[PDB]
Amino acid sequence: MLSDEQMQIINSLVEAHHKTYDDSYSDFVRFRPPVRRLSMLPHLADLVSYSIQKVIGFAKMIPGFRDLTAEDQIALLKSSAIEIIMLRSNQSFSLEDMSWSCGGPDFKYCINDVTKAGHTLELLEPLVKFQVGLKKLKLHEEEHVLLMAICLLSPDRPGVQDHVRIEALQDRLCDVLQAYIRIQHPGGRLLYAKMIQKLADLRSLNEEHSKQYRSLSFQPEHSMQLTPLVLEVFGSEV
Amino acid sequence: MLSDEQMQIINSLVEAHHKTYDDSYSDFVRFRPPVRRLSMLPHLADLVSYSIQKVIGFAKMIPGFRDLTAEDQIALLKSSAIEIIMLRSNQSFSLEDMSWSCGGPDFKYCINDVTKAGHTLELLEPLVKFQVGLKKLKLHEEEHVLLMAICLLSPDRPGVQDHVRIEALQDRLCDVLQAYIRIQHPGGRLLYAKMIQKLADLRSLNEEHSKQYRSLSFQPEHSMQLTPLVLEVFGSEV
């Protein structure tokens, strides 16, 4: 069975998530409205920008993260943000209609829509594949929140400094996850390994996005549709 | 009576305006919705950003402007944009309710609202005064469009180079305006001088905005609400 410190980690993460994720998606009406040349760009840019702020909020509450140098914090956020976005978005994803259901017709996001935001079907495909596979793991809220913190504390991120301390923090988290599945998750002998796998699939998805985004980013008529936060997090200014 | 060249200028300006100004304000639903900490900021930032693009569009069609160096064009836009914004906004201003009426409750803009976008009443007052006074001049569409082009081609703008050619273009425009009022505007012996006056009131309003904006601009939690175009036009990068 788990220890006191590990259990205090589970609480903190679960609380952080609840505090930064609304299952009713009521804030989406404050974004520039969706429109089905990259007519979805304005809306999705806002959805992503909103989410960064949320990932930041969650991150600030990951035990150990607050103590990292401002630079490393920034370094981890910049390189993992999009991955954390994809992970948390799974909660709104539906195997039923292969889309992120956040509202009526307006906030239901089809693969098609992400295209009207400058993204091809070729790379939109692996995202759905990742979403579907991840959904099938029927993760407990405690595992979903752990995986996000693991992802965030990957020492292998361009720009990181104290990669030894990042490495250590991530390992402490990886422990709690393995222990938790062992004790609390009936029927999950492979789960862990499966979850670790997901982290690598995210890396590809990340790299892929970087390319797509770079292109978009360089055309001023498009970058003018993005928000300051997006431009900053995905920007390449050292 | 007017000449052929002067009359060709009137047409071009009137057409440019019609092409860049919608009296139905139907595009406002694409902006982030208004909300009555600077809750109106997101919406107004979008309203202003939209307008810059429109002022650019109009500018590109001012006879003579297209031939200026890219730098001078940029220099004139950066320093006059806000002034042109205030001028064209007069069309939506209503002496009846002292507000810019662009839609139902949502798009009706009260002095109060601009406050929820980081602007004090002290300086919001002179704007209304300017709007009211300008409205009372019952300008013809031909005079309103001329005044905007005059304003835009003021040689006295920080950053301008060929101020002699700017000076000349503005004078050609000032001619057409004086001639037009003489020939076509029954009862306007003072009008011209009154209009030229307005240009100076704009200068103050401009300077005032610059200060307000600078403050806002420097607080990241606020500038993150603005758009790339606004940040660029009002930014101070040489």
């Binding site: 401002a70 914090q73 920034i74 910049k78 936060l229 | 990241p220 939690e221």
Partner: peptide
Amino acid sequence: KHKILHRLLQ
């Protein structure tokens, strides 16, 4: 740069 992130990180 990174003015926004620095601020959001408190």
